[PDB]
Amino acid sequence: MLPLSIEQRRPSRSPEYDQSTLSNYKDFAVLHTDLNLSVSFEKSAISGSVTFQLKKLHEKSDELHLDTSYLDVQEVHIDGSKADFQIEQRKEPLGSRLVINNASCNDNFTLNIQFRTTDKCTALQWLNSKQTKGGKPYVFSQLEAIHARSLFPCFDTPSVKSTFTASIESPLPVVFSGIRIEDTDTNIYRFEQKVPIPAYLIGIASGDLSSAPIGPRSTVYTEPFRLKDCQWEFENDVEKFIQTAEKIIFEYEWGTYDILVNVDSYPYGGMESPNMTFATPTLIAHDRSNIDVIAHELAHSWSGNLVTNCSWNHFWLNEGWTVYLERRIIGAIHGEPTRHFSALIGWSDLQNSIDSMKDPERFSTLVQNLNDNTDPDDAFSTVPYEKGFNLLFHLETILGGKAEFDPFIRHYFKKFAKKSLDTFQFLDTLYEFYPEKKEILDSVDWETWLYKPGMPPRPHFITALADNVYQLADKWVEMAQHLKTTEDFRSEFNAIDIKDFNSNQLVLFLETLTQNGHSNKKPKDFDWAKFPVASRALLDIYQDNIVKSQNAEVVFKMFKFQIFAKLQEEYKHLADWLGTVGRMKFVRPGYRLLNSVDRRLALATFDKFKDTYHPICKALVKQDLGL
């Protein structure tokens, strides 16, 4: 009932089969999973057992195949009886297939595997005591996309979702992607995940953590020194966000919405493990300006967590729907011009991602096509997010806007609640929900959106907030050249200029500057180093909103404008600041900025702070400096 030749591409069975799994999930039903784990900070390993409640499905060849990757499976036990297993030879990138003899049991059986993580585990990130400001060891898992198979043996595919129950022992406190149960100290933390989740959403963190309320159904976890700060950051908006998102879709389904603010050495940008959102400390600005980042993880509570991409071929249904709903939450809070601006910055992110991404012709396509050979990680770029946002936004516009599309959002998420789906399954629900709207629904070029690489059709977004940034930014470039005095500059420019700018406008503003403005009529090879008064006059007049900002996002862009402006005095300040942040995205280009202008400082800086970043952060920064 939908357009050829999209139908031509329609898999034979939906949800589409997951090539990234070596497991045979199509043969089993996972009724419930249980993790009994023990954290050893000293061995850098998690050891224990996983217990599945499985039901045999009959609808040809039969066996029990599980995913593992560099994992020590010690014993298996079916219904309490030893069961015969063997581990195949490792196949990049999908790992070793754990084959277990299931012949003996009945339809519904209890599967218990005992295992140890390996030195080669790719599921757990370990930080020593030099790597956290608190001074205690820390560990967190990062499981997306197929790393769960490295934490425990399982059907490592987004199409298999199972309730969870978890007992984790640790010398240090433990948080989990679940709700903690009452216990009755043996250092054993116990949690329940009452909603079915995929294993990539399984999240564990253990370290020196305390907690504080940030809402009626929200608590924040983080290092104690940072505890009251983090609480202040989240406590004003977190419940409001949840309610904004509940109005756009429907009641939040997970009970509590908690946030773990990870250690400073945390190199990533966040994770949406259900019941415990992993957040970056660079979210803590002390003014609540870099806070809308929470709407995204929160949004995942519906799209991705509640309704899952069945495979990493259909990841856009995870992340695209989430950027959409995310921008809808902020749009509801800050006004339509803001979501359009969010959207417009997103369009910018997409093009740099497409211009640059390797094999921009295979991976830039909205619906991916990983067979059993492509690492699912190649499917993760800005495409799913932005081009997926743009397709959902396009669908919104043509259907008569938010009030016409909003009913489709509630049917979709209500229809696939607790299940997985593919692209094709989404479209049918789309076509099925608008009988009347069938004629323009059909006007959509699904083939270019879903299956062509490169930039999708460009949408018309309100450019208001971006115009102001570009205008103000262009003006500085033009004025850099006519005005020769700090007092001259102080009279054409005022703190009111960037007053009503939000965090994202400052970042674009400061970024537009280093691109010598944002206009066709841009001075060619205009350089900010040649105008020492203009550059310094900018950070001077805008000291309160730019220079005095503790928003790491705004702080980095400032350092960039200062490295571009070749303001030699500030380098020590960029050097010092690289000692305060561990986020790969600040630390890395941050060490690149410092090295170009002042090689000797970068090297000294890196020498003093090398062993304080996440080991991966250090390797990559050490690479750029040529060590």
**Is 407 strand, coil or helix?**
helix
The answer to whether 300 is annotated as binding is yes
Closest of 576, 464, 474 to residue 523, by C-alpha? 474
Q: Binding site annotation covers 144?
A: yes
Q: Write out 217-257 in H/E/C secondary structure.
A: CEEEEECHHHHHHHHHHHCCCHHHHHHHHHHHCCCCCCCCC
Lookup result for tokens 């949408």: 459
32 labelled binding-site residue: no
Query: Tokens in use for 532?
Result: 């020492």
- Is there a binding annotation on residue 331? no
Write b or e for each residue in 418-447: b if 16 or more Cβ atoms lie within 10 A of its Cβ, otherwise e. eebbbbbbbbeebbebbeebeeebeebebe
* 360 assigned to a ligand binding site: no
CA–CA dist 440, 541 (Å, integer): 51
3-class state of residue 166 by DSSP: strand
Q: For residues 23 and 98, what is the distance between their CA atoms, to the nearest angstrom? A: 8
Question: What DSSP string describes 22-89?
Answer: -S-TTTEEEEEEEEEEEEETTTTEEEEEEEEEEEE-------EEEEESSEEEEEEEETTEE--EEEPP
* Whole-angstrom distance, CA of residue 303 vs CA of residue 416: 10
Among 346, 336, 254, 341, which residue's Cα sits nearest to residue 302?
254
DSSP 190-224: EEEEEEEE-GGG--EEESS-EEEEEETTEEEEE-G
Residues assigned a catalytic role: 297, 385
Q: DSSP secondary-structure letter at 303? A: B
256 touches 219 (CB < 8 A): yes
277: nearest Cα among 353, 370, 177: 177
CB atoms within 10 A of CB 57: 13
Is 268 annotated in a binding site? The answer is yes
For residue 271, say whether it is annotated as part of any ligand binding site. yes
**Residue 270 is assigned to a ligand binding site:** yes
Distance of alpha carbon 569 from alpha carbon 572, whole angstroms: 7
Total residue length of the chain: 627
Q: Please state the residue numbers annotated as binding site for Zn(2+).
A: 296, 300, 319
Q: Please state the residue numbers annotated as binding site for substrate.
A: 142-144, 267-272
Q: Please state the residue numbers annotated as binding site.
A: 142-144, 267-272, 296, 300, 319
